[PDB]
Coordinates of C-alpha atoms and ligand atoms in Angstrom, one line a residue:
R5 CA 174.3 -50.5 34.9
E6 CA 176.7 -52.1 32.5
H7 CA 179.9 -53.6 34.0
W8 CA 183.2 -54.9 32.8
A9 CA 182.9 -58.6 32.5
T10 CA 186.4 -59.7 33.3
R11 CA 189.5 -58.2 35.1
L12 CA 191.6 -58.7 32.1
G13 CA 189.0 -57.0 29.8
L14 CA 188.9 -54.1 32.2
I15 CA 192.7 -53.7 32.3
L16 CA 193.1 -54.0 28.5
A17 CA 190.2 -51.5 27.9
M18 CA 191.8 -49.0 30.3
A19 CA 195.2 -49.6 28.7
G20 CA 193.6 -49.1 25.3
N21 CA 192.0 -45.9 26.6
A22 CA 195.5 -44.7 27.5
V23 CA 197.8 -46.3 24.8
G24 CA 197.1 -44.1 21.8
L25 CA 198.4 -41.6 19.2
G26 CA 199.9 -39.9 22.3
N27 CA 202.4 -42.8 22.7
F28 CA 203.5 -43.1 19.1
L29 CA 203.1 -39.6 17.7
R30 CA 203.1 -37.1 20.5
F31 CA 205.7 -38.5 22.9
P32 CA 208.5 -38.8 20.3
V33 CA 208.0 -35.1 19.2
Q34 CA 207.8 -33.8 22.8
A35 CA 210.9 -35.7 23.8
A36 CA 212.9 -34.7 20.7
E37 CA 212.0 -31.0 20.8
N38 CA 213.0 -30.8 24.5
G39 CA 216.4 -32.3 24.4
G40 CA 215.6 -36.0 24.5
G41 CA 217.1 -37.2 27.8
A42 CA 216.6 -33.7 29.3
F43 CA 212.9 -34.2 28.9
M44 CA 212.9 -37.6 30.5
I45 CA 213.8 -36.5 34.1
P46 CA 210.8 -34.1 34.4
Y47 CA 208.7 -36.7 32.6
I48 CA 209.5 -39.4 35.2
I49 CA 209.0 -37.0 38.1
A50 CA 205.6 -35.9 36.6
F51 CA 204.5 -39.5 36.2
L52 CA 205.3 -40.1 39.9
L53 CA 203.9 -36.9 41.3
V54 CA 201.0 -36.3 38.9
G55 CA 200.3 -39.2 36.7
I56 CA 200.0 -42.0 39.2
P57 CA 198.1 -40.1 42.0
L58 CA 195.6 -38.5 39.5
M59 CA 195.0 -41.9 37.8
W60 CA 194.0 -43.4 41.2
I61 CA 191.8 -40.4 41.9
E62 CA 190.0 -40.7 38.6
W63 CA 189.4 -44.4 39.0
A64 CA 188.0 -43.8 42.5
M65 CA 185.7 -41.0 41.4
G66 CA 184.4 -43.1 38.5
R67 CA 183.7 -46.2 40.6
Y68 CA 182.1 -44.0 43.3
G69 CA 179.8 -42.4 40.8
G70 CA 178.9 -45.6 39.0
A71 CA 177.7 -47.2 42.2
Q72 CA 175.0 -44.5 42.2
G73 CA 174.2 -44.6 38.5
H74 CA 176.5 -41.8 37.3
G75 CA 179.5 -42.0 35.1
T76 CA 180.2 -38.4 34.2
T77 CA 181.5 -35.3 36.1
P78 CA 178.5 -33.0 36.1
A79 CA 176.7 -35.6 38.3
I80 CA 179.8 -37.0 40.1
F81 CA 181.2 -33.6 41.1
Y82 CA 177.8 -32.8 42.6
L83 CA 177.8 -36.1 44.5
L84 CA 181.2 -35.0 45.9
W85 CA 180.2 -31.4 46.5
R86 CA 176.5 -30.6 46.7
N87 CA 176.7 -27.1 45.1
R88 CA 175.3 -25.9 41.8
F89 CA 178.8 -24.7 40.9
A90 CA 179.9 -28.4 41.1
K91 CA 177.6 -29.2 38.2
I92 CA 179.0 -26.3 36.1
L93 CA 182.6 -27.2 36.8
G94 CA 181.6 -30.8 35.8
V95 CA 180.6 -29.7 32.3
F96 CA 184.3 -29.7 31.5
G97 CA 184.3 -33.5 31.9
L98 CA 182.0 -33.7 28.9
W99 CA 183.4 -30.7 27.0
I100 CA 187.0 -31.7 27.0
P101 CA 186.5 -35.3 25.7
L102 CA 184.1 -34.0 23.1
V103 CA 186.4 -31.3 21.8
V104 CA 189.3 -33.7 21.8
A105 CA 187.3 -36.4 20.0
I106 CA 186.5 -33.9 17.3
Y107 CA 190.1 -33.6 16.2
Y108 CA 191.4 -36.9 17.5
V109 CA 189.1 -39.0 15.4
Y110 CA 190.0 -37.0 12.3
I111 CA 193.8 -37.7 12.9
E112 CA 192.9 -41.3 13.6
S113 CA 191.2 -41.4 10.2
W114 CA 194.4 -40.3 8.5
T115 CA 196.2 -43.3 9.8
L116 CA 193.4 -45.6 8.4
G117 CA 193.7 -43.8 5.0
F118 CA 197.5 -44.0 5.0
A119 CA 197.3 -47.7 6.0
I120 CA 195.0 -48.5 3.1
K121 CA 197.2 -46.6 0.6
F122 CA 200.4 -48.1 1.9
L123 CA 198.8 -51.6 1.8
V124 CA 197.8 -51.2 -1.8
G125 CA 201.0 -49.5 -2.8
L126 CA 199.5 -46.2 -3.8
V127 CA 202.4 -44.2 -2.3
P128 CA 205.1 -41.8 -3.5
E129 CA 208.1 -43.3 -5.4
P130 CA 211.2 -41.4 -4.2
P131 CA 213.9 -41.1 -6.9
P132 CA 216.7 -43.7 -6.1
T135 CA 220.2 -40.1 -2.6
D136 CA 219.6 -36.4 -1.7
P137 CA 217.3 -36.4 1.4
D138 CA 215.0 -33.6 0.1
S139 CA 214.2 -35.7 -3.0
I140 CA 213.2 -38.5 -0.6
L141 CA 211.2 -36.5 1.9
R142 CA 209.5 -34.1 -0.5
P143 CA 207.2 -36.7 -2.1
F144 CA 206.1 -37.9 1.3
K145 CA 205.5 -34.3 2.4
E146 CA 203.4 -33.7 -0.7
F147 CA 201.5 -37.0 -0.1
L148 CA 200.4 -35.8 3.4
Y149 CA 199.7 -32.3 2.2
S150 CA 197.5 -33.5 -0.6
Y151 CA 195.6 -35.9 1.7
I152 CA 194.6 -33.3 4.3
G153 CA 194.7 -30.4 1.8
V154 CA 197.2 -28.0 3.3
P155 CA 196.7 -24.4 2.1
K156 CA 198.8 -23.6 -1.0
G157 CA 197.9 -19.9 -1.0
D158 CA 197.0 -17.2 1.6
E159 CA 193.5 -18.3 2.7
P160 CA 193.4 -20.4 5.9
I161 CA 191.3 -23.1 4.2
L162 CA 192.0 -26.8 4.0
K163 CA 190.9 -28.9 1.0
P164 CA 190.9 -32.6 2.2
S165 CA 191.0 -35.1 -0.7
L166 CA 187.7 -37.0 -1.4
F167 CA 189.5 -40.2 -0.2
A168 CA 190.4 -38.6 3.2
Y169 CA 186.8 -37.5 3.7
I170 CA 185.3 -40.9 2.9
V171 CA 187.9 -42.5 5.2
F172 CA 186.8 -40.2 8.0
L173 CA 183.2 -41.4 7.5
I174 CA 184.4 -45.0 7.6
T175 CA 186.4 -44.2 10.8
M176 CA 183.3 -42.8 12.4
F177 CA 181.4 -45.9 11.4
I178 CA 184.0 -48.2 12.9
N179 CA 183.9 -46.2 16.2
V180 CA 180.1 -46.4 16.3
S181 CA 180.1 -50.1 15.5
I182 CA 182.2 -50.8 18.6
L183 CA 180.4 -48.3 20.9
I184 CA 176.9 -49.3 20.0
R185 CA 177.6 -52.8 21.3
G186 CA 178.3 -51.3 24.8
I187 CA 180.9 -51.8 27.5
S188 CA 181.4 -55.5 27.8
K189 CA 180.3 -56.7 24.3
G190 CA 181.8 -53.6 22.5
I191 CA 184.7 -51.9 24.1
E192 CA 185.9 -54.8 26.3
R193 CA 185.7 -57.4 23.5
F194 CA 187.5 -55.1 21.0
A195 CA 190.2 -54.3 23.5
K196 CA 191.0 -58.0 24.0
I197 CA 191.8 -58.2 20.3
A198 CA 193.3 -54.8 19.6
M199 CA 195.8 -54.6 22.5
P200 CA 197.7 -57.8 21.7
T201 CA 197.7 -57.0 18.0
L202 CA 199.0 -53.5 18.9
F203 CA 201.8 -54.9 21.1
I204 CA 202.8 -57.4 18.5
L205 CA 203.0 -54.8 15.6
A206 CA 204.9 -52.4 17.8
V207 CA 207.5 -55.0 18.9
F208 CA 208.0 -56.1 15.3
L209 CA 208.5 -52.4 14.3
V210 CA 211.0 -51.8 17.1
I211 CA 213.0 -54.8 15.9
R212 CA 213.0 -53.7 12.3
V213 CA 214.0 -50.2 13.3
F214 CA 216.9 -51.5 15.4
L215 CA 218.3 -53.0 12.3
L216 CA 218.8 -49.6 10.7
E217 CA 222.3 -48.4 10.0
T218 CA 223.4 -45.7 7.6
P219 CA 226.5 -43.5 7.2
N220 CA 224.7 -41.1 9.6
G221 CA 224.2 -43.4 12.4
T222 CA 222.4 -46.4 14.0
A223 CA 219.2 -46.9 16.0
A224 CA 221.3 -47.0 19.1
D225 CA 222.4 -43.4 18.5
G226 CA 218.6 -42.6 18.8
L227 CA 218.3 -44.5 22.1
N228 CA 221.3 -42.7 23.6
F229 CA 219.9 -39.4 22.6
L230 CA 216.6 -40.1 24.4
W231 CA 218.0 -41.8 27.5
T232 CA 220.9 -39.6 28.4
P233 CA 220.1 -37.1 31.2
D234 CA 220.8 -33.4 30.9
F235 CA 220.3 -31.8 34.3
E236 CA 221.0 -28.3 32.8
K237 CA 217.4 -28.2 31.6
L238 CA 215.7 -29.1 34.9
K239 CA 215.6 -25.4 35.6
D240 CA 213.5 -24.7 32.4
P241 CA 209.8 -24.1 33.0
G242 CA 209.2 -25.0 29.4
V243 CA 210.5 -28.5 29.7
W244 CA 208.3 -29.0 32.8
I245 CA 205.2 -27.7 31.1
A246 CA 206.0 -30.0 28.2
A247 CA 206.5 -33.1 30.4
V248 CA 203.4 -32.6 32.6
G249 CA 201.3 -31.9 29.5
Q250 CA 202.5 -35.1 27.9
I251 CA 201.8 -37.1 31.1
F252 CA 198.2 -35.8 31.2
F253 CA 197.6 -36.5 27.5
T254 CA 199.2 -39.9 27.6
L255 CA 197.5 -41.2 30.6
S256 CA 194.0 -39.8 29.5
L257 CA 194.0 -37.7 32.7
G258 CA 191.7 -34.7 32.9
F259 CA 189.6 -35.9 29.9
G260 CA 186.8 -37.4 32.0
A261 CA 187.5 -40.7 30.1
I262 CA 189.1 -42.7 32.9
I263 CA 186.3 -41.5 35.2
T264 CA 183.6 -42.8 32.9
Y265 CA 185.3 -46.2 32.2
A266 CA 185.8 -46.7 35.9
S267 CA 182.1 -46.0 36.5
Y268 CA 181.5 -49.5 35.0
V269 CA 183.8 -51.2 37.6
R270 CA 181.7 -53.0 40.3
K271 CA 181.6 -51.1 43.6
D272 CA 183.6 -53.8 45.4
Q273 CA 186.3 -54.3 42.8
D274 CA 189.9 -53.2 43.2
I275 CA 191.0 -50.0 41.5
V276 CA 194.4 -49.6 43.1
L277 CA 196.3 -52.5 41.4
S278 CA 194.1 -52.2 38.2
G279 CA 194.8 -48.4 37.9
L280 CA 198.5 -48.9 38.5
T281 CA 198.7 -51.7 36.0
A282 CA 197.0 -49.7 33.2
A283 CA 199.2 -46.7 33.9
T284 CA 202.3 -48.9 33.9
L285 CA 201.2 -50.6 30.7
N286 CA 200.9 -47.2 29.1
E287 CA 204.3 -46.1 30.2
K288 CA 206.0 -49.2 28.8
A289 CA 204.2 -48.7 25.5
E290 CA 205.2 -45.0 25.5
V291 CA 208.8 -45.0 26.5
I292 CA 209.9 -48.5 25.4
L293 CA 207.8 -48.9 22.2
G294 CA 206.8 -45.4 21.1
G295 CA 210.2 -44.1 22.1
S296 CA 212.1 -46.8 20.2
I297 CA 210.5 -46.5 16.8
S298 CA 210.4 -42.9 15.4
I299 CA 213.4 -41.2 17.0
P300 CA 215.9 -44.0 16.5
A301 CA 214.8 -44.4 12.9
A302 CA 215.1 -40.6 12.3
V303 CA 218.5 -40.4 14.1
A304 CA 219.8 -43.4 12.3
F305 CA 219.1 -41.9 8.9
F306 CA 219.7 -38.2 9.5
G307 CA 221.7 -37.9 12.7
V308 CA 220.6 -36.2 15.9
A309 CA 220.6 -32.5 15.0
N310 CA 218.5 -33.2 11.9
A311 CA 216.2 -35.5 13.7
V312 CA 215.6 -32.8 16.3
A313 CA 215.0 -30.2 13.5
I314 CA 212.4 -32.6 12.1
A315 CA 210.6 -33.0 15.4
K316 CA 210.5 -29.2 15.8
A317 CA 209.1 -28.8 12.3
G318 CA 205.6 -30.1 13.2
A319 CA 203.5 -32.5 15.2
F320 CA 203.0 -34.7 12.1
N321 CA 206.3 -34.5 10.3
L322 CA 208.0 -37.3 12.1
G323 CA 205.1 -39.8 12.0
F324 CA 203.4 -39.1 8.7
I325 CA 206.3 -37.9 6.5
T326 CA 209.7 -38.8 7.9
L327 CA 209.1 -42.4 9.1
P328 CA 207.5 -43.6 5.9
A329 CA 210.2 -41.9 3.8
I330 CA 212.9 -43.7 5.8
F331 CA 211.0 -47.0 5.4
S332 CA 210.7 -46.4 1.6
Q333 CA 214.5 -46.8 1.4
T334 CA 214.3 -50.4 2.7
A335 CA 213.2 -53.7 1.2
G336 CA 209.5 -54.2 1.9
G337 CA 209.4 -50.6 3.2
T338 CA 205.9 -49.9 1.8
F339 CA 204.5 -52.8 3.8
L340 CA 206.4 -51.7 6.8
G341 CA 204.7 -48.3 6.3
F342 CA 201.4 -50.2 6.3
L343 CA 202.2 -51.9 9.6
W344 CA 203.1 -48.5 11.1
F345 CA 199.9 -46.8 10.1
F346 CA 197.8 -49.9 11.0
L347 CA 199.5 -49.7 14.5
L348 CA 198.6 -46.0 14.8
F349 CA 195.0 -46.8 13.7
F350 CA 194.4 -49.4 16.4
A351 CA 196.1 -47.2 18.9
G352 CA 193.9 -44.3 17.9
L353 CA 190.7 -46.4 17.7
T354 CA 191.0 -47.9 21.2
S355 CA 191.4 -44.2 22.5
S356 CA 188.7 -42.5 20.5
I357 CA 186.1 -44.8 21.7
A358 CA 187.2 -43.9 25.2
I359 CA 186.7 -40.1 24.7
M360 CA 183.3 -40.6 23.1
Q361 CA 182.0 -42.8 25.9
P362 CA 181.6 -39.8 28.3
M363 CA 179.0 -38.1 26.2
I364 CA 177.3 -41.4 25.6
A365 CA 177.3 -42.1 29.4
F366 CA 175.9 -38.7 30.1
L367 CA 173.0 -39.1 27.6
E368 CA 172.3 -42.6 29.0
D369 CA 172.7 -41.8 32.7
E370 CA 171.2 -38.3 32.9
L371 CA 168.9 -37.9 29.9
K372 CA 167.9 -41.6 29.9
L373 CA 168.6 -42.2 26.2
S374 CA 168.9 -45.8 25.0
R375 CA 172.5 -46.7 24.2
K376 CA 171.7 -46.8 20.5
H377 CA 170.4 -43.2 20.5
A378 CA 173.1 -42.0 22.8
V379 CA 175.8 -43.4 20.5
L380 CA 174.2 -42.1 17.3
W381 CA 173.7 -38.6 18.6
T382 CA 177.2 -38.5 20.0
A383 CA 178.5 -39.6 16.6
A384 CA 176.4 -37.0 14.8
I385 CA 177.8 -34.2 17.0
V386 CA 181.4 -35.3 16.6
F387 CA 180.9 -35.9 12.8
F388 CA 179.3 -32.5 12.3
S389 CA 181.8 -30.5 14.4
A390 CA 184.8 -32.2 12.8
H391 CA 184.0 -30.3 9.6
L392 CA 185.6 -27.3 11.4
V393 CA 188.9 -29.2 11.9
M394 CA 188.7 -30.7 8.3
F395 CA 188.3 -27.3 6.5
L396 CA 189.7 -24.5 8.6
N397 CA 193.5 -24.3 8.8
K398 CA 194.8 -24.6 12.4
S399 CA 191.4 -25.2 14.0
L400 CA 192.8 -28.5 15.1
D401 CA 195.7 -26.7 16.9
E402 CA 193.3 -24.3 18.7
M403 CA 191.1 -27.2 20.0
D404 CA 194.1 -29.2 21.0
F405 CA 195.3 -26.2 23.0
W406 CA 192.2 -25.2 24.9
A407 CA 190.8 -28.6 25.6
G408 CA 193.7 -31.0 25.1
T409 CA 196.4 -28.9 26.8
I410 CA 195.3 -26.2 29.1
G411 CA 191.9 -27.7 29.8
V412 CA 193.1 -31.0 31.1
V413 CA 195.6 -29.6 33.5
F414 CA 192.9 -27.2 34.8
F415 CA 190.4 -30.0 35.1
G416 CA 192.9 -32.3 36.8
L417 CA 193.5 -29.7 39.4
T418 CA 189.8 -29.1 39.7
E419 CA 188.9 -32.8 40.2
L420 CA 191.7 -33.1 42.8
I421 CA 190.5 -30.1 44.8
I422 CA 186.9 -31.4 44.7
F423 CA 187.8 -34.9 45.7
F424 CA 190.7 -34.5 48.1
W425 CA 189.9 -31.1 49.6
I426 CA 186.1 -30.5 49.5
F427 CA 184.7 -34.0 49.6
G428 CA 187.5 -34.7 52.2
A429 CA 191.0 -36.0 52.0
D430 CA 190.3 -38.8 54.5
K431 CA 187.0 -39.9 52.8
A432 CA 188.8 -39.7 49.5
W433 CA 191.7 -41.9 50.7
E434 CA 189.2 -44.4 52.1
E435 CA 187.3 -44.5 48.8
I436 CA 190.4 -45.0 46.7
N437 CA 191.7 -47.9 48.9
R438 CA 188.4 -49.7 49.4
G439 CA 188.5 -53.2 47.9
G440 CA 192.1 -52.7 46.9
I441 CA 194.2 -55.8 46.2
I442 CA 197.0 -53.5 47.3
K443 CA 196.9 -50.3 49.3
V444 CA 198.2 -47.0 48.0
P445 CA 201.6 -46.3 49.7
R446 CA 201.0 -44.0 52.6
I447 CA 203.4 -41.3 51.2
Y448 CA 200.9 -40.8 48.4
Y449 CA 198.3 -39.3 50.8
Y450 CA 200.6 -36.4 51.3
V451 CA 201.5 -36.1 47.6
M452 CA 197.8 -36.1 46.7
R453 CA 196.7 -33.6 49.4
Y454 CA 199.7 -31.2 49.3
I455 CA 202.2 -31.8 46.5
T456 CA 200.2 -32.5 43.4
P457 CA 197.8 -29.5 43.7
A458 CA 200.7 -27.1 44.4
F459 CA 202.6 -28.5 41.5
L460 CA 199.7 -28.0 39.1
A461 CA 198.7 -24.6 40.5
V462 CA 202.2 -23.3 39.9
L463 CA 202.3 -24.8 36.4
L464 CA 199.0 -23.2 35.5
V465 CA 200.1 -19.8 36.7
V466 CA 203.3 -19.9 34.7
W467 CA 201.3 -21.0 31.7
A468 CA 198.9 -18.1 32.0
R469 CA 201.7 -15.6 32.6
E470 CA 204.5 -16.6 30.2
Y471 CA 202.7 -18.3 27.3
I472 CA 199.0 -17.6 26.8
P473 CA 199.4 -13.9 26.1
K474 CA 201.1 -14.8 22.8
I475 CA 198.3 -17.2 21.9
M476 CA 195.7 -14.6 22.6
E477 CA 197.4 -11.8 20.7
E478 CA 199.8 -13.3 18.1
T479 CA 197.3 -15.6 16.3
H480 CA 195.5 -15.2 13.0
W481 CA 191.9 -13.9 13.4
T482 CA 190.4 -17.2 12.3
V483 CA 191.3 -18.7 15.7
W484 CA 188.1 -16.9 16.9
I485 CA 186.0 -19.1 14.7
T486 CA 187.2 -22.1 16.6
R487 CA 187.0 -20.4 20.0
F488 CA 183.5 -19.3 19.2
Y489 CA 182.4 -22.8 18.2
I490 CA 183.9 -24.6 21.2
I491 CA 182.5 -22.0 23.6
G492 CA 179.1 -22.6 22.0
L493 CA 179.7 -26.3 22.6
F494 CA 180.2 -25.6 26.3
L495 CA 177.0 -23.6 26.5
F496 CA 175.1 -26.4 24.7
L497 CA 176.4 -29.0 27.2
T498 CA 175.5 -26.7 30.2
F499 CA 172.0 -26.5 28.8
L500 CA 171.9 -30.3 28.6
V501 CA 173.0 -30.5 32.3
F502 CA 170.2 -28.0 33.1
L503 CA 167.7 -30.2 31.3
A504 CA 168.9 -33.3 33.2
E505 CA 168.4 -31.5 36.5
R506 CA 164.9 -30.5 35.4
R507 CA 164.2 -34.1 34.4
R508 CA 165.4 -35.4 37.8
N509 CA 163.2 -32.8 39.4
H510 CA 160.1 -33.9 37.5
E511 CA 161.0 -37.6 38.1
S512 CA 161.4 -37.1 41.9
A513 CA 158.0 -35.3 41.9
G514 CA 156.4 -38.3 40.3
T515 CA 158.1 -40.7 42.8
Ligands
BOG1 C1 178.5 -26.2 6.5 C2 178.8 -27.6 5.8 C3 178.3 -28.7 6.7 C4 178.8 -30.1 6.1 C5 179.2 -29.9 4.6 C6 180.2 -31.0 4.2 C7 180.5 -30.9 2.7 C8 181.5 -32.0 2.4 O1 182.0 -31.7 1.1 C9 182.9 -32.7 0.5 O2 184.2 -32.4 0.8 C10 185.1 -33.4 0.3 C11 186.5 -33.2 0.9 O3 187.0 -31.9 0.6 C12 185.2 -33.4 -1.2 O4 185.9 -34.5 -1.6 C13 183.7 -33.4 -1.9 O5 183.8 -32.8 -3.1 C14 182.6 -32.7 -1.0 O6 181.4 -33.3 -1.3
BOG2 C1 188.3 -47.6 1.5 C2 187.6 -47.3 0.1 C3 187.6 -45.7 0.0 C4 187.2 -45.4 -1.5 C5 187.3 -43.9 -1.7 C6 187.2 -43.5 -3.2 C7 187.6 -42.1 -3.4 C8 187.5 -41.7 -4.9 O1 188.4 -40.7 -5.2 C9 188.9 -40.5 -6.5 O2 189.9 -41.5 -6.7 C10 190.5 -41.4 -8.0 C11 191.5 -42.5 -8.2 O3 192.3 -42.7 -7.1 C12 191.2 -40.0 -8.2 O4 191.6 -39.9 -9.6 C13 190.3 -38.8 -7.8 O5 191.2 -37.8 -7.5 C14 189.3 -39.0 -6.7 O6 188.2 -38.2 -6.9
BOG3 C1 182.9 -25.4 8.5 C2 182.6 -26.7 7.8 C3 182.0 -26.4 6.4 C4 183.1 -26.2 5.4 C5 183.1 -27.3 4.3 C6 182.2 -26.9 3.2 C7 182.4 -27.9 2.0 C8 182.5 -27.0 0.7 O1 182.6 -27.9 -0.4 C9 183.3 -27.5 -1.5 O2 182.5 -26.8 -2.4 C10 183.3 -26.2 -3.5 C11 182.4 -25.3 -4.4 O3 181.1 -25.7 -4.3 C12 184.0 -27.3 -4.3 O4 185.1 -26.6 -5.0 C13 184.6 -28.4 -3.5 O5 184.5 -29.6 -4.3 C14 184.1 -28.7 -2.1 O6 185.1 -29.1 -1.3
BOG4 C1 185.0 -23.0 8.3 C2 185.7 -22.2 7.2 C3 186.1 -23.1 6.0 C4 184.9 -23.3 5.1 C5 185.3 -24.0 3.8 C6 185.4 -23.0 2.7 C7 185.3 -23.7 1.3 C8 185.5 -22.7 0.2 O1 184.7 -22.8 -0.9 C9 184.2 -21.7 -1.5 O2 182.8 -21.6 -1.2 C10 182.3 -20.3 -1.7 C11 180.9 -20.1 -1.1 O3 180.0 -21.2 -1.4 C12 182.3 -20.2 -3.2 O4 182.0 -18.9 -3.6 C13 183.6 -20.7 -3.8 O5 183.3 -21.3 -5.1 C14 184.5 -21.7 -3.0 O6 185.8 -21.3 -3.2
BOG5 C1 206.6 -39.1 45.6 C2 206.0 -40.5 45.0 C3 206.8 -41.6 45.7 C4 206.2 -43.0 45.3 C5 207.1 -44.1 45.8 C6 206.5 -44.9 46.9 C7 207.4 -46.1 47.2 C8 206.7 -47.0 48.2 O1 207.3 -47.0 49.5 C9 206.9 -47.9 50.4 O2 205.6 -47.6 50.9 C10 205.1 -48.7 51.7 C11 203.6 -48.4 52.1 O3 203.5 -47.1 52.6 C12 205.9 -48.8 53.0 O4 205.6 -50.0 53.7 C13 207.5 -48.8 52.8 O5 208.1 -48.2 54.0 C14 208.0 -48.0 51.6 O6 209.1 -48.6 51.1
LIG6 C1 192.8 -38.2 24.8 C2 193.4 -39.5 25.2 C3 192.4 -40.7 25.0 C4 194.7 -39.8 24.4 C5 195.4 -41.1 24.6 N1 195.7 -41.3 26.1 C6 196.7 -41.1 23.8 O1 197.8 -41.2 24.4 O2 196.7 -41.0 22.6
CL7 CL1 194.3 -38.9 -1.0
NA8 NA1 199.0 -42.8 26.1
NA9 NA1 194.2 -46.4 22.3

């Protein structure tokens, strides 16, 4: 089996797994929509009660499976719980990353396309004072790129440039993955992560220099870091916070599990897992939190900045920020640096959510790496046509896989590892070879608190939010639901073929 070559390479690869579009695009919007500082308390609590403990659990499961030649959940769940239902539950650990990859790589390609256009100066020219006259051109720029519907039909018409850039983006992902764990992902991470940190710090510094009649960057920081205990009683803020913690730490996506399956059986995962999680949180709350919101608040003030965040998931990052930058000397190049930052952030993450399908094809169907990467790329490329052409398909996938699915799967993997496999065997497995030990209090959090927390959250989700999503949506959501259910059936069939192959192999040995 492949292994990470160095400790630093492993840490930077896992940090790159985590530090993505989630830190720079998703976090600011989630925080802004939910009262800034009012979001942060639940967010910190969720990190401590869900993020940290689940990170350790996923590292442990991955390392445990890898020692036996398995990096994905169909096989790993079965190793933990020898029951056919384990294998079926395990399909989610392939299905989630695949469905998320389908839309995530497309959004990642937008950042490459924008980076290129900002670099070469093919960007809107706002008329030099009224905000709308400054934002509108950038709104139109994004809408023309992805082809937002201008009429009634729920159909997208991406530009030719966007489509070609998606092809290039797929090619770049493949070129890293096809080189494997140590020569591909690890090597790339040693270059991308420092570059990413440098760009982000530079952008924070530039943003902190912003001052207008409407405010300063510091007003943005105060908004985000001022506690509001009157929201702690709102289930919505908790659901938001926990969802962001899952997405941001790559938890419940089977991706941490697969990366950890390349860690040697003896190697520490306690300090390593904690460091990766901690690096992600610094990049999220310090870097991600200090770019978009402070820029927006400085130029528009808090109320408007909040209204912008609520407008869409992409307004703040693809429209508002570049518009703000355009009003400053060298602002187009600053826009380039921003999109280049997002691209590297996305790229180090998308390789992580494609690796689970690759590992499954290698481990369970015995494909060569080359064929496993190419088939994985073909499935993602093909499927992405749904997200590229059908309005709001992206939103549906992000909900079922990227939102509900990961919380469900996080709870599932915890129950399988800490309840069925056995809490004490699980604890031993986590701490084995640890440079540090997990604090004793975390045994009780993992066994009792975390699962209760998640169960309650999932119930509130199903009761107070999913009814609307099932009944108040346009009929075209069933196109996406049909397709991703078919993907689940296809993956279950592959797991069935893998057990048949194992049966035929064992009969020959
Ligand atoms: C069922 C269809 C399977 C894959 C068909 C993909 C067809 C891609 O179509 C392309 O879309 C681009 C972006 O809109 C346009 O720039 C090009 O005109 C067009 O060739
Ligand atoms: C990184 C290299 C990507 C090259 C993609 C080329 C896409 C060609 O796209 C064309 O570009 C023309 C000029 O911009 C436009 O007039 C047309 O709308 C468009 O068809
Ligand atoms: C679900 C994924 C398949 C949808 C993408 C199909 C691509 C359709 O392609 C379209 O064909 C039209 C007429 O031929 C042309 O007007 C456009 O150039 C082109 O975008
Ligand atoms: C997955 C749903 C989105 C698919 C993209 C629809 C692209 C619309 O393209 C349409 O294709 C029709 C059939 O070829 C043609 O009759 C029309 O010329 C054209 O408008
Ligand atoms: C609910 C999540 C709380 C996480 C914070 C744990 C802080 C670590 O707490 C420490 O743990 C050590 C090892 O058990 C003990 O030696 C110390 O008594 C204690 O200070
Ligand atoms: C799906 C995950 C790989 C996403 C990544 N953790 C991010 O924050 O963007
Ligand atoms: Cl374009
Ligand atoms: Na993240
Ligand atoms: Na990343």
